[PDB]
Amino acid sequence: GTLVASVLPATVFEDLAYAELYSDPPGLTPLPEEAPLIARSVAKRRNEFITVRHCARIALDQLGVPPAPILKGDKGEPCWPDGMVGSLTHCAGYRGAVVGRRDAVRSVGIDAEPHDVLPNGVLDAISLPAERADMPRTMPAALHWDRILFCAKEATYKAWFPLTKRWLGFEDAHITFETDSTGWTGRFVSRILIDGSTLSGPPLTTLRGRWSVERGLVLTAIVL
Ligand SMILES: Nc1ncnc2c1ncn2[C@@H]1O[C@H](COP(=O)(O)O)[C@@H](OP(=O)(O)O)[C@H]1O
Ligand SMILES: [Mn+2]
Ligand SMILES: [Mn+2]
Question: Which UniProt keywords apply?
Fold first, then answer.
């Protein structure tokens, strides 16, 4: 499908690709070098791991990148082929991978969750008092803004960490939202409250991403 295309820019076709599934189609296996990572993993984990890397390899193949194992590195972050970047996400009913060429794309962060209210207490634990106040006013009451905030915080971390290799807690970023007049999609900009020093290039002070609610899921993505 093309749900995640709703939260990506349209201009980078040569240096950005994506792939998604809504299930774990029987038959997929990990590459030989990936199997030790799930040898002792629960069934749910084996499946999401295998399926999402299948998607990652379809996206890479669209960009002329031969298949390759995708291991986990610093703090669980995925290890991409030479010259490539990307992000992965899996939740109930969704698996998604977005990859890009490092020259044109500097980093990717994506996240997917079911469009449902947050469980008890997690909201206060992932949001600043100013966000809880400003956010609900910016979008319709049909949306679970708490969950959308959540996904945007996680997308911000995924885009941020490969570039700094430093922790970004939920209180270290202020995110602001804006909805387009369809009522189900929009934008957000994440303003960094701590040192944005990166290992290469200019520091990160703002991350502009997109969000939408498609087919009962929330999707967010940042493309630097
Ligand atoms: N520090 C980190 N930085 C960037 N990406 C990370 C990360 N830790 C995990 N990821 C990725 O987050 C993915 C899961 O996202 P989500 O929680 O939304 O389902 C992980 O999938 P994998 O463990 O299968 O590689 C991993 O690829
Ligand atoms: Mn997951
Ligand atoms: Mn997530």
Answer: Magnesium, Metal-binding, Transferase
